[PDB]
Amino acid sequence: QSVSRAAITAAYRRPETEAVSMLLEQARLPQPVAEQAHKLAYQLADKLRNQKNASGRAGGVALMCLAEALLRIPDKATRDALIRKGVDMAMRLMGEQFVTGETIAEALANARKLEEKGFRYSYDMLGEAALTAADAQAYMVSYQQAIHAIGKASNGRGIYEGPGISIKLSALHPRYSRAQYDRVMEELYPRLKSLTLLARQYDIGINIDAEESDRLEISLDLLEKLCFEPELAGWNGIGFVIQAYQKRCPLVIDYLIDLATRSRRRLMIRLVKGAYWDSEIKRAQMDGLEGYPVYTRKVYTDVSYLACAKKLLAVPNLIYPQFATHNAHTLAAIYQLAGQNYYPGQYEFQCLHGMGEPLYEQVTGKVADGKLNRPCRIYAPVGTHETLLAYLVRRLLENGANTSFVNRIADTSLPLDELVADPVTAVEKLAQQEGQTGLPHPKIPLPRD
């Protein structure tokens, strides 16, 4: 193939100057909206930094120990007068903060606390990249069991206010990374269909997570078919992730808008930046192809996310946008771009368990409690230590990258105004300095170079 699908294919690895130049005016926040976003982003970030007055205290150590000792003198007068194992253990130590529970039942029992404050959940049974038939079957069973449990705890609250599930197509088909069209359709699809039908019976959201870029196309074929199942007609609980770090992302949105039209539904669309960037670059560098399927400067991903957010927010009849981010500017800009006259079903935010709660405690909840009154859905990984590895590694990359917001916020030296700097302005600043808009990262030449 269709006009919308062909356009996706042709953007796969489009030159970065070109891609970024095309996104720029689509992402630009109008003057007024830009400054309200700056102001809200600044406040959110400031409050995150200075939680227990960790700024005002920052404004030696030897004297403090002596001063401490003197203050333990009770009477003022007297005071005046005078390899394989270490890796496994490191992974589960760092990983506990990211896991909401070992079993789906323990994860749900712990859901009341934030659900009452207005948070929602999407549970993920940890596991991906099934190698064998037995692995994939076992994932299929863990997903079914999860859907029964979440569905019973949802108890009719529905797709927006109630919990959902997130699934990985790589978990449901052995050797998914290289599987061909015909075998995926014969084997993967019936399983996707079956879980989705089950999610529909309990009226919970079911979201298909996005993985590596060479699986985008097949995920779209699977989604297309799913959306035309007679048994799913009139049901708007199907969710799909799109990754703004991909050059294809805006063309994927055009496709999704048309799909929602043709299949007569509202799609739940989770807009993310993306989790596999280090691997995507390495992959593209090994295949020696004409370009990258992702951007090479982080600020360009920020610009793509804003442009894509506008596209999504423009079609509320077709798309329920789920804006996944821990970046205060991103959050603030979405909040402003969504416009006046918010209603619950317009959009929600999302965050990963162990990363987002502090930012979103300023967001989800009552205006009279100093909150924004916008719902946030926490992504909640569920499983034991043997299913954690890949997810943890991705979190370490995310938390430890010096371009990450969550890394830069903890950097006292970097002033708030730089931390929440408008990405469009940053791209324009780079373009005046370097002589062209959207030049690739200077340390990431094309694969053929």
Helices (H), 319-422: 328-337, 357-360, 389-400, 405-408, 416-419
Out of 16, 115, 135, 209, point to the residue binding ligand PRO (CB under 6 A). Answer: 209
- Residue 320 backbone dihedrals phi, psi, to 5 degrees: -100, 105
Distance between CA atoms of residues 218 and 185, nearest Å: 9
Say if residues 236 and 159 touch (Cβ distance below 8 Å): yes
- With 0-12 / 13-18 / 19 or more C-beta atoms within 10 angstroms meaning exposed / middle / buried, residue 371 is middle
Residue 360: which of ligand FAD, ligand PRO, none does it interact with, CB under 5 to 8 A by kind? none
Q: Does 5 bind ligand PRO (CB under 6 A)?
A: no
Print the binding letters for residues 216-255 with ligand FAD: x by CB under 6 A, - otherwise.
Answer: -------------------------x-x-x----------
Distance between CA atoms of residues 401 and 420, nearest Å: 17
Query: DSSP class of residue 404?
Result: S
Q: Does 120 bind ligand FAD (CB under 6 A)?
A: no
Cβ at position 86, least distance to ligand FAD in Å: 26
Print the binding letters for residues 23-62 with ligand FAD: x by CB under 6 A, - otherwise.
Answer: ----------------------------------------
The amino acid present at 432, given as its one-letter code, is Q
Out of 49, 92, 157, 394, point to the residue binding ligand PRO (CB under 6 A). Answer: 394
Which of 263/279 has CB closer to ligand FAD?
Answer: 279
Pairing of the two strands 319-324 and 376-382: unpaired
For residue 389, which of 105, 178, 107, 129 has the smallest C-alpha distance? 129
Residue 391: which of ligand FAD, ligand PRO, none does it interact with, CB under 5 to 8 A by kind? ligand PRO
Distance between CA atoms of residues 440 and 306, nearest Å: 19
Q: Does 392 bind ligand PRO (CB under 6 A)?
A: no
Residue with tokens 């048309």: 258
Distance between CA atoms of residues 402 and 282, nearest Å: 19
Distance between CA atoms of residues 372 and 343, nearest Å: 13
Beta strands in 289-394 (DSSP E): 319-324, 348-352, 376-382
Give the range of 84-92, 217-225, 300-308, 431-439 binding ligand FAD by CB under 6 A: 300-308
Residues in the chain, total:
449
Which of 291/381 has CB closer to ligand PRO?
Answer: 381
Cβ at position 437, least distance to ligand PRO in Å: 30
Out of 98, 255, 277, 360, point to the residue binding ligand FAD (CB under 6 A). Answer: 277
Reading the block at residue 377, the tokens are: 């859905």
Give the range of 33-41, 108-116, 266-274, 336-344 binding ligand FAD by CB under 6 A: 266-274
Q: What is the dihedral of CA 406, 282, 300, 345, to 10 degrees?
A: -60
Out of 9, 201, 384, 403, point to the residue binding ligand FAD (CB under 6 A). Answer: 403
Print the binding letters for residues 218-257 with ligand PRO: x by CB under 6 A, - otherwise.
Answer: ----------------------------------------
Q: Does 176 bind ligand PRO (CB under 6 A)?
A: no
Q: Does 352 bind ligand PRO (CB under 6 A)?
A: yes
Q: Does 441 bind ligand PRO (CB under 6 A)?
A: no
Distance between CA atoms of residues 415 and 417, nearest Å: 6
Q: Does 273 bind ligand FAD (CB under 6 A)?
A: yes
Task: Specify which residues 380 forms β-bridges with.
Answer: 123
Distance between CA atoms of residues 211 and 295, nearest Å: 16
Q: Which residues bind ligand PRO (CB under 6 A)?
A: 209, 275, 352, 379, 391, 394
| Contact footprint for ligand FAD (CB under 6 A) | 209-210, 241, 243, 245, 270, 272-277, 294-298, 300-302, 324-327, 330, 350-352, 379, 398, 401, 403-405, 441
